[PDB]
Design a protein around this ligand. Structure first.
Ligand code: CLA
Ligand code: CLA
Ligand code: CLA
Ligand code: CLA
Ligand code: CLA
Ligand code: CLA
Ligand code: CLA
Ligand code: CLA
Ligand SMILES: CCCCCCCCCCCCCCCC(=O)OC[C@H](COP(=O)(O)OC[C@@H](O)CO)OC(=O)CCCCCCCCCCCCCCC
Ligand SMILES: CCCCCCCCCCCCO[C@H]1O[C@H](CO)[C@@H](O[C@H]2O[C@H](CO)[C@@H](O)[C@H](O)[C@H]2O)[C@H](O)[C@H]1O
Ligand SMILES: CC1=C(C/C=C(\C)CCC[C@H](C)CCC[C@H](C)CCCC(C)C)C(=O)c2ccccc2C1=O
Lengths: 164, 144, 72, 741, 41, 80, 73, 73
């Protein structure tokens, strides 16, 4: 109960919709023998389903008027009420991987311009070079903020313009 | 030595059975452009108005309705066959005007005696702004 | 039609219509004053955007008025 | 021997050295990129074999081994469907109850919840209900076991590696010379006799000795594990004489010309097999026998190494008349030194064959339990009309490429081809008129019916209870071809189909095929079809005949086939090239074929398909075609809105993938309008503004970002228009017809 | 086969190997971790 | 009558004249280049403005330059 | 209520895009750089790629993560 | 549902301004065409040269936004 909401372990339309889905799976399950793999598959679907509802209520996800897990994307309402795993943890779990791919792709382009013809090595990726920058870019925020302090991250007004 | 050749319409046409892409009623009111060349040997060229006509030895007279239809004929008569044509401009009052080797020499090569019109003794990046050429009577490009 | 087809497919099509008008018997009595040319490039933007926008507006306004007042 | 084997030993070293250098085929590409237009021109010019080199022999060797690459991929594709027919299917269960068990041969993996796409297709099985109708091929082939599907899947992998070997061998190791390919007399004698003739002789022998005794035992009713295996149907003549009692006479009635004694298993029944809904297989057996004797006879027509037989240079040059000057002189020389001139004639008829195939298979369903499967019937029609329609536009594209590249004005003087160009203004303008005539007098009938029905004047519409425009001629042919076994085809037991009239075939409580009555709504929509095809002809033929020159641009062939324009001059010259006419024709082919498959999918559901109760048979949509196809609003209400209620609420079911692609292709269609409307010089400047922010953070790429080319942004646009357009109708049709049929 | 490894190191081949890597990694994780809507512990 | 005005960044490689499909352009002597020549447009009455000239100029920020003005019966490219 | 809202939204939509249209006509027909040395209007044209690339980031971020959430749903 | 659609409105507002502010700023020229001010506001193109310049003008940069405007509204 943060913004008119309720815990999904406490709401009833959530549990009503769980019983709605398991009803649809079981009336689909009835057409098969109890040994048959079209019934082994559906009972494995249920145990993935029933554990999914158990795990969403375990994490304390917020339901509402429709009985669905609602997310809270604000720190200070997720840090305070124990919901940083909804948005506030994957907003840095993403931005680690995002700037990682950016930094590896940056370092591959920076370390290819001092060559004979760098356009050839954007077709033919230097795999012993590219994987070497791939592994060693794992501390990229530790390397970027040191490059941020110099002035070597931002190229100056050598950049190309039209008519300022 | 060279000056302004005239025309006789007596010169034979290429053997061409006629196309529907030929002249129009503009030839009878505004203008139509006739083209002459001197062919060495009998061979088969393409009409710019679709099809194929065969040229005959000596002079060859042909007529079109556009200027590009004549110059896209000389382009395949000079580059392919190394002939030297010239096309004119005929008005329906009988007046004729000489057009393409207008000083004898073809325009890709210098004649040293043709006058350099429509030039700017300045760089294209040094045009003025359109605020300066505003209210020039009519609408006017800043390159004037 | 004014957005996907552009001008120069249409100017060639009009050149056949000019031919078929200037060679048709008993329609050569009739001749135009302004020469038929295809709509220019900037015009085709405007005419196509106008047909896009009028048909956009009349579609939704028909759906807006009749879905509201149909049940109300 | 003028007709002789002529190859060249080892023209190309088999080496990976040229895979290291992309763009090696062309001079303009082998120097590496400096611009992202390089990697698009790499894939665009890749199979443009006429543009790589000038040597016609080197072109011919490239297209000969690329055809083994296409055949080798088809053999992988066929062997996939037999393998997915074998290991992941219900073809074992389907044969015992082919009325209730839905055909299914694709099974998905249970990972993200996508196992819900494994529907309850029956037969103790879960999987995607397929619609490609392989199970109806296989009952017609008498497969009866998943062992047979597995052995012909391994036979497909073996054949694909043989085809990959053959293209490797006939290019790299021993590649033919030019005059091998220019024996078109020897190619047609071999392809009419050996491919088409001996192929249909061999398949008839499969139908005599395998499929007829298997499917006679299935129709008489035998469980498929109890039927004799088809090699026992060869080694034992006494088994075959039990089913068809004329195998006991052996092959003596053939050589003694007592062919009437083969009347048990080569028949002329006609109509349909009422047990199974399909055509009679003994009818299709006498078909492929008589097809084979026809093509083997026609395969001995042309002259190769002995003086008998015709020569195609003399055949063409003799057929000349007083209206056409030289006649067909010079067409042999351009159909032998130009592949595009071949490819245009080939894609025309091969595309036109596909539409013949589509119309001749709903009406005469050749496979057992094909007609009652309404999902297979809708897909096999719709697919084979589109595959036809693309190939017909490919005829217009590669005929234009002939006019630009391989056309010779020298050798073409006053033949047919020269005289078509010389009156190309009369061709297009009389075609321009008849498109405008068909425009008003077909679609304006719909606007008339819309207006009269909206103005409360239903007696002034064009319908059956109103101003009646009957299809008199097509209703006359249905009165003749149904009465054709009376005296014009006296040896037919029934009609050639059931569309012409008669009674229906009830299989499994569903209509296999009932007669089709044509009305004023069928009149208007057939003239819609005549309209959209004539406009598609208009655009493509304008691109062919004005490929080289016009009154607009006289030097157009010097600019080439695929160029954008000649600039903004002379009013503007956007889309003047012959590429651009087959750009615009794809929309009209899309426009023509959508109305073909809409007129199929609603005439059948209103007037053919549906469940039979022997109590006043009811159709799927209730019988509302002639009642409602007068108006555009009838196509809006009763077809695109009423039948869309199985693709929009199909979530939580196996048809929910079709609901996604229904939104998926509604996206990709509209995504194309970003490309079809906008232009390059916008998007290049926007790239400059974001190269600037990539210059600023030192991530400027070396292969420099450019906007897509003028012809490319059009080609991206029509490709996403067709992909988003067709896959909309794909998912609309299949989510409709799998549920209600 | 050095020229063959250049082909394996071109742009679309590394793209179709790395995308089978990255999808195939996320497919195996989404098998052994069924339906991660929220970061648990 | 279109407005074709060329500039001093011309080098006189005369590719614009060879590309002009209407003989708008010709080559005049001028000392500001090695080839001793600079183009000129004495026939802009005949120009359509199809800009085949400035597809062909090698110089950065094209030396020849076509301004689409008012269109007569010769500028619209009309046989009629 | 349905008509009066939808009317003055499309009327607002056309008027707002004409503000930028006649704003773009300003830079061609009326702008004078010698008159506008260094003011806030010329600094707009000075860092004009920073404007367009940061709009192109916001538009691209929103389109990725609004459509991507609807397709996920 | 109202979270997602206001961001979609925000998408449509930021993208319509992206097209228009680019049409204002690049009305005087780009690197593709550094003298766009010499032609004027509403011109067709600058030919097929320099890679092709369909829809290069600031008019043609304004008209693309009307599609993204009618989308947004
Ligand atoms: C558009 C930005 C925005 C808005 C409208 C809000 C809105 C709110 N925040 Mg908030 N917040 C934001 C960004 C925002 N936050 C960011 C970026 C941070 C830093 C990570 C925080 C950190 C934060 C804290 C630490 C707290 C809030 C609190 C609050 C509430 C007062 C209110 C719901 C407070 C709250 O719960 O209510 C008192 C509170 O304790 N926020
Ligand atoms: C027998 C069939 C056949 C054959 C052999 C050819 C052969 C050729 N065509 Mg042709 N064509 C055909 C059918 C055929 N065509 C048909 C049916 C059409 C009508 C659609 C055309 C329309 C056409 C045009 C308009 C052009 C050609 C061109 C060419 C030449 C080069 C093609 C190339 O390198 O592209 C290499 C291959 C590609 C670039 C692939 C294209 C990508 C497609 C469009 C995407 C669709 C794939 C799939 C269906 C979508 C799902 C994929 C999924 C990942 C989403 C070559 C001579 C070109 C030419 O000669 O240039 C002068 C040319 O401009 N053709
Ligand atoms: C029907 C599918 C098909 C087929 C048979 C071919 C066939 C061919 N392509 Mg091709 N191609 C295709 C689809 C196809 N392409 C598509 C969809 C694209 C993307 C648009 C390309 C892009 C492409 C490029 C860029 C190049 C080729 C090349 C080649 C030739 C080299 C043969 C080779 O190395 O095989 C051996 C390969 C194997 C995998 C062996 C099979 C085991 C051959 C004619 C090359 C060429 O013609 O250069 C002269 C070349 O450079 N192709
Ligand atoms: C009677 C002999 C015969 C037969 C059966 C064929 C059959 C074929 N030819 Mg063909 N051809 C022949 C003689 C023959 N040709 C002669 C004499 C010439 C020279 C004038 C050519 C020149 C020629 C060209 C230039 C092309 C073909 C192509 C084709 C294929 C058409 C593709 C198709 O529709 O799929 C039908 C597919 C099948 C029926 C699958 C079975 C395939 C069989 C096993 C291979 C064909 C039999 C082979 C010719 C016999 C030699 C066996 C080999 C081991 C030596 C098809 C495989 C086209 C093709 O696809 O290229 C590869 C093509 O481009 N042929
Ligand atoms: C290429 C096709 C093909 C092949 C491989 C065969 C092969 C065979 N047929 Mg067959 N047959 C064929 C076409 C074919 N036929 C056609 C088209 C007809 C109809 C005229 C027949 C009618 C026929 C009869 C009536 C009989 C055979 C028989 C046979 C078998 C022995 C032939 C013999 O005695 O000498 C042999 C397996 C005999 C046995 O079969 C089991 C037999 O009684 N055939
Ligand atoms: C629904 C949209 C639409 C419509 C109506 C048209 C209409 C037309 N297209 Mg077309 N086109 C479209 C979309 C459309 N196109 C698209 C999206 C493309 C993109 C690829 C093209 C590409 C295209 C090409 C490439 C070609 C056409 C052609 C044609 C014409 C042939 C039909 C004809 O003459 O019938 C007559 C007109 C109609 C049926 C429209 C309805 C009019 C009704 C029936 C009566 C008229 C009203 C009446 C006079 C009252 C007026 C009121 C008064 C106040 C003025 C016609 C002008 C072809 C052409 O011009 O040559 C024939 C042609 O070559 N179009
Ligand atoms: C206060 C309002 C206002 C004023 C005074 C102007 C004034 C001007 N504008 Mg501007 N403009 C405005 C609002 C305004 N605009 C808005 C709101 C937009 C965005 C939609 C634009 C977009 C715009 C552009 C893009 C251009 C101008 C141009 C011009 C100038 C030329 C006028 C012109 O072309 O008219 C003539 C107008 C017409 C002939 C109307 C064309 C047809 C329209 C779309 C109406 C179609 C409606 C349709 C027929 C509905 C009937 C459907 C039927 C079924 C019932 C002039 C200074 C031009 C300029 O200065 O060039 C440099 C120019 O290029 N304006
Ligand atoms: C439904 C149609 C549609 C769509 C999707 C777009 C989308 C876009 N337009 Mg728009 N546009 C359209 C119609 C459309 N437009 C029309 C009709 C016009 C009038 C001509 C315009 C005119 C226009 C202009 C003038 C501008 C845009 C811009 C943009 C971009 C906005 C940024 C954004 O949201 O990025 C998000 C994009 C997406 C979510 C689409 C990507 C889809 C997925 C994520 C890609 C990956 C999926 C999958 C892996 C790919 C499969 C391919 C293969 C593997 C099989 C975006 C690409 C602006 C721009 O460039 O901003 C950066 C811009 O300046 N457009
Ligand atoms: C279809 C009616 C075609 C008429 C027909 O009988 O064609 C036959 C006639 C040509 O007849 P010939 O006997 O001269 O032709 C011998 C043929 O082998 C071609 O040379 O065609 C022409 O007169 C030109 C046709 C244009 C007609 C276009 C009308 C549409
Ligand atoms: C590719 C060459 C073209 C010709 C096709 C040949 C395909 C190979 C088929 C071999 C299969 C055996 O075929 C043949 O076996 C037996 C031997 O005559 C025949 O069987 C018959 O002859 C036996 C002895 O005469 C007796 O049991 C019976 O008369 C009867 O069973 C079959 O009627 C025939 O099918
Ligand atoms: C949007 C658009 C563009 C912009 C489209 C850009 C230039 C290309 C789109 C993205 C391309 C496909 C690059 C993306 C993939 C690259 C291979 C980079 C891959 C990197 C990772 C994704 C692996 C045009 O260039 C254009 C040109 C002419 C008319 C209309 C338009 C048009 O509408």
């Amino acid at each position: 109960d943060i913004a008119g909401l309720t815990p999904c372990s406490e709401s009833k339309a959530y549990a009503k919709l769980e019983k709605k889905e398991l009803k649809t799976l079981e009336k689909r399950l009835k057409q098969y023998e109890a040994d048959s793999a079209p019934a082994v598959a559906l009972k494995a679907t249920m145990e993935r389903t029933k554990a999914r509802f158990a795990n969403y209520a375990k994490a304390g996800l917020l339901c509402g008027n429709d009985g669905l897990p609602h997310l809270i994307a604000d720190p200070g309402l997720a840090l305070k009420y124990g919901h940083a795993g909804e948005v506030f943890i994957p907003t840095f779990g993403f931005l680690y991987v995002a700037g990682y791919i950016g930094y590896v792709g940056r370092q591959y382009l920076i370390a290819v311009k001092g060559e004979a013809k760098p356009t050839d090595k954007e077709i033919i990726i230097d795999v012993p070079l590219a994987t070497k920058l791939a592994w060693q870019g794992a501390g990229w925020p530790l390397a970027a903020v040191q490059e941020l302090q110099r002035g070597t991250l931002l190229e100056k007004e050598e950049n190309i313009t039209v008519s300022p | 030595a060279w000056t302004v050749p005239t025309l006789n319409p007596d010169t034979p046409s290429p053997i061409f059975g006629g196309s529907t892409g030929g002249l129009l009623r503009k030839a009878q009111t505004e203008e139509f452009y006739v083209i002459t060349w001197e062919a060495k040997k009998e061979q088969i060229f393409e009409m710019p108005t679709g099809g194929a006509a065969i040229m005959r030895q000596g002079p060859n007279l042909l007529k079109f309705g556009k200027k590009e239809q004549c110059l896209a004929l000389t382009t395949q008569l000079r580059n392919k066959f190394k002939l030297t044509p010239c096309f004119y401009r005929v008005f329906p009052d009988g007046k004729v005007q000489y057009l393409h080797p207008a000083d004898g020499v073809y325009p890709e090569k210098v004649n040293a005696g043709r006058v350099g019109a429509n030039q700017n003794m300045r760089r294209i990046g040094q045009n003025v702004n359109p605020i300066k050429v505003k209210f020039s009577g009519r609408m006017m490009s800043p390159a004037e | 039609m004014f957005l996907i087809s552009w001008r120069g497919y249409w100017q060639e099509l009009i050149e056949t219509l000019v031919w078929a008008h200037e060679k048709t018997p008993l329609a050569n009595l009739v001749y135009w004053k302004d020469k038929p040319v295809a709509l220019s490039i900037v015009q085709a933007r405007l005419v196509g955007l106008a047909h896009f926008s009028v048909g956009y507006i009349f579609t939704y306004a028909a759906f807006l008025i009749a879905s509201t007042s149909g049940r109300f | 021997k003028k007709v002789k084997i002529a190859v060249d030993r080892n023209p190309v070293e088999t080496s990976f050295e040229k895979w290291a250098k992309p763009g090696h085929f062309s001079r303009t590409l082998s120097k590496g990129p400096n611009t992202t237009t390089w990697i698009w021109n790499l894939h665009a010019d890749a199979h443009d074999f006429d543009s790589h080199t000038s040597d016609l022999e080197e072109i011919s060797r490239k297209v000969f081994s690329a055809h083994f690459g296409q055949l080798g991929i088809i053999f992988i594709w066929l062997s996939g469907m037999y393998f997915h027919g074998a290991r992941f299917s219900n073809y074992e269960a389907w044969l015992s109850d082919p009325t209730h068990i839905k055909p299914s041969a694709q099974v998905v993996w249970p990972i993200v919840g996508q196992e819900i796409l494994n529907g309850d297709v029956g037969g103790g099985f879960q999987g995607i209900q397929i619609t490609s109708g392989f199970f109806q091929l296989w009952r017609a082939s008498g497969i009866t076991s998943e062992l047979q599907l597995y052995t012909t899947a391994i036979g497909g992998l073996v054949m694909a590696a043989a085809m990959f070997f053959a293209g490797w061998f006939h290019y790299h190791k021993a590649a033919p010379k030019l005059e091998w390919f220019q024996n078109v007399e020897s190619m047609l004698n071999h392809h009419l006799g050996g491919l088409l003739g001996l192929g249909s002789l061999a398949w008839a022998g499969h139908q005599i000795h395998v499929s007829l005794p298997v499917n006679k035992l299935l129709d008489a009713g035998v469980d498929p594990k109890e039927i004799p295996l088809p090699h026992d149907l060869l080694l034992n003549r006494a088994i075959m004489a039990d089913l068809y009692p004329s195998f006991a006479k052996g092959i003596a009635p053939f050589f003694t010309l007592n062919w009437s004694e083969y009347s048990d298993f080569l028949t002329f029944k006609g109509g349909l097999n009422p047990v199974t809904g399909g055509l009679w297989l003994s009818d299709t057996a006498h078909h492929h026998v008589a097809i084979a004797v026809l093509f083997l006879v026609a395969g001995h027509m042309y002259r190769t190494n002995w003086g008998i037989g015709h020569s195609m240079k003399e055949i063409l040059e003799a057929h000349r008349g007083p209206f056409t000057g030289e006649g067909h002189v010079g067409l042999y020389e351009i159909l032998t030194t130009s592949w595009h001139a071949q490819l245009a004639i080939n894609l025309a008829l091969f595309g036109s064959l596909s539409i013949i195939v589509a119309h001749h298979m709903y009406a005469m369903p050749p496979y057992p339990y094909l007609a009652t499967d309404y999902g297979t019937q809708l897909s096999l029609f719709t697919h084979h009309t589109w595959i036809g329609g693309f190939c017909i536009v490919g005829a217009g594209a590669h005929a234009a490429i002939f006019m630009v590249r391989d056309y010779d004005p020298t050798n073409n003087y006053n033949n047919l081809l020269d005289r078509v160009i010389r009156h190309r203004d009369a061709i297009i303008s009389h075609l321009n008129w008849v498109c405008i005539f068909l425009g008003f007098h077909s679609f304006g009938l719909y606007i008339h019916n819309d207006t009269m029905s909206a103005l409360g004047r239903p007696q002034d519409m064009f319908s059956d209870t109103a101003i009646q425009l009957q299809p008199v001629f097509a209703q006359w042919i249905q009165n003749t071809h149904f009465l054709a076994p009376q005296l014009t085809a006296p040896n037919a037991l029934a009609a050639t189909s059931l569309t012409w009239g008669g009674d229906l075939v009830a299989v499994g409580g569903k209509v296999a095929m009932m007669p089709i009555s044509l009305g004023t709504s069928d009149f208007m929509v057939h003239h819609i079809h005549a309209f959209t095809i004539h406009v598609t002809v208009l655009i493509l033929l304008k691109g062919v005949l004005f490929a080289r020159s016009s009154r607009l641009i006289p030097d157009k062939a010097n600019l080439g086939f695929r160029f954008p324009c000649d600039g903004p001059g002379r009013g503007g010259t956007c889309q003047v090239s012959a590429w651009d006419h087959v750009f615009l024709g794809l929309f009209w082919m899309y426009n023509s074929l959508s109305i073909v498959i809409f007129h199929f999918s609603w005439k059948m559901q209103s007037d053919v398909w549906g469940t039979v109760t022997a109590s006043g048979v009811s159709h799927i949509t209730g019988g509302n075609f002639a009642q409602s196809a007068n108006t555009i609003n009838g196509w809006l209400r009763d077809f695109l809105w009423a039948q869309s209620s199985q693709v929009i609420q199909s979530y939580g079911s196996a048809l929910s993938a079709y609901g996604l692609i229904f939104l998926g292709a509604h996206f990709v269609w509209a995504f194309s309008l970003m490309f079809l409307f906008s232009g390059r010089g916008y998007w290049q400047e926007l790239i400059e503004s974001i190269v600037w922010a990539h210059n600023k953070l030192k991530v400027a790429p070396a292969i420099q970002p450019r906007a897509l080319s003028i012809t490319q942004g059009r080609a991206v646009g029509v490709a996403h228009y067709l992909l988003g357009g067709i896959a909309t109708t794909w998912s609309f049709f299949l989510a409709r017809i799998i549920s209600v049929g | 086969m050095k020229d063959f490894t250049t082909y394996l190191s071109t742009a679309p081949v590394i793209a179709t190997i790395w995308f089978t890597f990255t999808a195939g990694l996320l497919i195996e994780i989404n098998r052994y971790f069924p339906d991660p809507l929220v970061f648990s512990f | 009558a279109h407005i074709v005005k060329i500039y001093d960044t011309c080098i006189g490689c005369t590719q614009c004249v060879r590309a002009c499909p209407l003989d708008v352009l010709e080559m005049v002597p001028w000392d500001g280049c090695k080839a001793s020549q600079m183009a000129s447009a004495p026939r802009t009455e005949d120009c359509v403005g199809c800009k085949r000239c400035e597809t062909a100029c090698p110089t950065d920020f094209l030396s020849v330059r076509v301004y689409l003005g008012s269109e007569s019966t010769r500028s619209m490219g009309l046989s009629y | 209520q349905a008509a009066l809202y939808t009317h003055h939204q499309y009327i607002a939509g056309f008027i707002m895009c004409g503000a930028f249209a006649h704003g773009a006509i300003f830079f061609i027909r009326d702008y004078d750089p010698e008159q506008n040395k260094g003011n806030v209007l010329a600094r707009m044209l000075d860092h004009k790629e920073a404007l367009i690339s940061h709009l192109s980031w916001v538009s691209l971020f929103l389109g990725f993560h609004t459509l991507g959430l609807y397709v996920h749903n | 549902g109202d979270f997602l659609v206001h961001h979609a409105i925000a998408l449509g507002l930021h993208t319509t301004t992206l097209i228009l502010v680019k049409g204002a700023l690049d009305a005087r020229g780009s690197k593709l065409m550094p003298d766009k001010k010499d032609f004027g506001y509403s011109f067709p193109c600058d030919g097929p040269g320099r890679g092709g310049t369909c829809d290069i003008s600031a008019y043609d940069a304004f008209y693309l936004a009307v599609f993204w405007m009618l989308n947004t509204i």
